[PDB]
Design an enzyme around this catalytic site. Structure first.
Site, PDB file in Angstrom:
ATOM      1  N   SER A 189       0.868  -1.188   0.000  1.00 37.52           N
ATOM      2  CA  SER A 189       0.000   0.000   0.000  1.00 37.52           C
ATOM      3  C   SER A 189       0.902   1.234   0.000  1.00 37.52           C
ATOM      4  O   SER A 189       1.785   1.335  -0.870  1.00 37.52           O
ATOM      5  CB  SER A 189      -0.988  -0.099   1.153  1.00 37.52           C
ATOM      6  OG  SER A 189      -1.897   0.989   1.125  1.00 37.52           O
ATOM      7  N   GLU A 305      -9.289  -4.115  -5.294  1.00 32.63           N
ATOM      8  CA  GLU A 305      -8.598  -3.146  -4.444  1.00 32.63           C
ATOM      9  C   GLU A 305      -9.566  -2.162  -3.797  1.00 32.63           C
ATOM     10  O   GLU A 305      -9.377  -1.765  -2.641  1.00 32.63           O
ATOM     11  CB  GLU A 305      -7.548  -2.383  -5.255  1.00 32.63           C
ATOM     12  CG  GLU A 305      -6.372  -3.226  -5.729  1.00 32.63           C
ATOM     13  CD  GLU A 305      -5.328  -3.456  -4.643  1.00 32.63           C
ATOM     14  OE1 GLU A 305      -5.505  -2.946  -3.511  1.00 32.63           O
ATOM     15  OE2 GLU A 305      -4.327  -4.147  -4.928  1.00 32.63           O
ATOM     16  N   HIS A 397      -7.915  -4.890  -0.690  1.00 32.16           N
ATOM     17  CA  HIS A 397      -6.667  -4.242  -0.307  1.00 32.16           C
ATOM     18  C   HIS A 397      -6.121  -4.827   0.991  1.00 32.16           C
ATOM     19  O   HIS A 397      -6.836  -4.921   1.994  1.00 32.16           O
ATOM     20  CB  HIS A 397      -6.904  -2.741  -0.156  1.00 32.16           C
ATOM     21  CG  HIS A 397      -5.655  -1.919  -0.189  1.00 32.16           C
ATOM     22  ND1 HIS A 397      -4.791  -1.928  -1.262  1.00 32.16           N
ATOM     23  CD2 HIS A 397      -5.138  -1.044   0.706  1.00 32.16           C
ATOM     24  CE1 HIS A 397      -3.788  -1.102  -1.021  1.00 32.16           C
ATOM     25  NE2 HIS A 397      -3.977  -0.550   0.164  1.00 32.16           N
TER      26      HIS A 397
END
Length: 485
Positions: A189, A305, A397
């Site tokens: 990330s 995501e 995510h």
């Protein structure tokens, strides 16, 4: 072999075991007082053996991004790192993997149980995790800060901290069983976003031969130094008063000004800027001009995501979806609807997730992959779909972190998805496969193995999919954003 090692600043004592663990090693002087909003400085040496059995303090950041931290607290005095290494590792023996956690450039810590480096180190690597400055203390520009600066710039102190940790690794890897010529920086990330931006930085030269980017946010809008410094001056024109403000107070003050809803067209409230020193230009311009370090790169995304970013605003009806499209895209709402129609194939939530993931992750990953191929880099790409066989949702995510680190412990943000009894055998099989591939990338510069065929992305856009049932398979050509986007 005893858990005592000599850093360039002095000896440290860690924890013994088949994998030796060291925690809370300083890699820079505490950035407090006059050193707040300065580049990280070299730490001072010490005598005797310094304790390294407990994590150092976490850097200041959004509280929800450290929920579950194993650290004893929070402090501006937070530039600490942690090392896992096979017991009895000789100097220069193993490759090194240096982790960069993500917290939206707003928070986070290395002291998460799912960032424990033991399972990786047991496969024959030296694992390094570390804290860096974030939020307003790591990313902040001000005219007085630019005035006092040796480079005449300001901001991006968190990126400088990443670089300082990498320099520490260069100088100290051999003492901990590692090879400074075989360093792979990997992150997730915002950490992967930082790695990606540093691939366009002249300051990253010679600090790693490999980079693994797990769900980086790239080709996103970045603020210029002029605008960020004007914003900082609006916060307080007197830099001295800013430096004399308690860090929790200033953090809360800045947090109150954050937007509750995320505008895709705006820069991050706190994050990397085009300072002209760390980042002489946007990563899009650097991509276009070929200003990319052609290091070995493993890059990829997860299937969905955007789902983790949905929020709580109602998104159930076509009216809700239309209202969102109008709010975010204005007169281009019809065009975005044409590219992302509610035609019965997906729910409004699923379409908003598609839009968010494409704009914030998938587009930048495609752009960086293509540019890395164009620059002659050794580059591999993946998509982590996860194990969907039992009706599990496609991976969103963060979902791939336990499959890389090998620590199947649930996170506090509800991102890791497996039954309450524990991960399925397919989950553990996929984790073994993926973690072994990561280790192979660190060892040989290549994630392929004798049981996993994985051609480079430069060959027919080949992309490894970590699909269902604990299996992996190459897809050629790989994932592609809709051309209308």
């Amino acid at each position: 072999d005893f858990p005592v090692r000599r850093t360039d600043l002095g000896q440290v004592q860690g924890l013994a075991g088949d994998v030796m663990s060291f925690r809370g090693i300083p890699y820079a002087a505490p950035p407090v007082g006059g050193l707040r909003w300065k580049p990280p400085q070299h730490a001072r040496p010490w005598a005797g053996v310094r304790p390294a059995t407990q994590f150092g303090s976490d850097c200041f950041g959004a509280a929800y991004l450290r929920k579950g931290s194993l650290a004893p607290g929070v402090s501006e005095d937070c530039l600490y790192l942690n090392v896992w290494a096979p017991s009895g590792a000789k100097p220069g023996q193993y490759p090194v993997m240096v982790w960069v956690y993500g917290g939206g450039f707003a928070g986070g810590t290395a002291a998460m149980p799912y960032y424990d480096g033991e399972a990786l180190a047991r496969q024959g690597v030296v694992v390094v995790t570390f804290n860096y400055r974030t939020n307003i203390l790591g990313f902040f520009a001000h005219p007085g800060l630019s005035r006092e600066s040796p480079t005449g710039t300001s901001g991006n102190y968190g990126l400088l901290d990443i670089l300082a940790a990498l320099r520490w690794v260069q100088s100290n890897a051999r003492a901990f069983g590692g090879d400074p010529g075989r360093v792979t920086v990997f992150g997730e990330s915002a950490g992967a976003s930082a790695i990606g931006l540093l691939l366009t930085s002249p300051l990253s030269k010679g600090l790693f031969r490999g980079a693994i980017l797990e769900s980086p946010g790239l080709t996103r809008p970045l603020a210029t130094l002029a605008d960020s410094a004007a914003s900082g001056e609006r916060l307080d024109a007197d830099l001295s008063r800013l430096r004399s403000t308690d860090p929790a107070t200033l953090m809360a003050r800045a947090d109150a000004a954050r937007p509750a809803s995320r505008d895709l067209r705006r820069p991050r409230p706190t994050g990397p800027i085009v300072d002209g020193h760390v980042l002489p230009q946007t990563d899009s311009a650097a991509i276009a001009a070929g200003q990319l370090a052609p290091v070995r790169v493993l890059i990829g995304t997860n299937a969905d995501e955007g789902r983790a970013f949905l929020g709580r605003a109602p998104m159930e009806t076509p009216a809700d979806y239309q209202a969102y499209l109008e709010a975010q895209f204005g007169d281009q709402a019809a065009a975005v609807a044409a590219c992302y129609p509610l035609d019965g194939r997906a729910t409004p939530k699923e379409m908003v997730a598609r839009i968010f993931g494409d704009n914030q992750f998938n587009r930048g990953v495609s752009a960086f992959s293509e540019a890395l191929v164009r620059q002659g880099a050794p580059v591999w790409r993946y998509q982590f779909n996860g194990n969907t066989e039992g009706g599990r949702a496609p991976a969103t995510h963060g979902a791939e972190i336990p499959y890389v680190f090998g620590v199947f412990k649930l996170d506090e943000l509800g991102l890791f998805d497996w039954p309450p009894e524990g991960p399925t055998p397919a989950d553990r099989a996929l984790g073994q496969l993926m973690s072994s591939a990561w280790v192979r990338f660190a060892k040989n510069g290549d994630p392929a193995g004798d049981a996993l065929t994985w051609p480079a992305y430069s060959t027919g856009k080949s992309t490894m999919t970590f699909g269902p049932e604990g299996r992996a398979a190459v897809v050629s050509p790989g994932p592609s954003i809709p051309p209308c986007a």
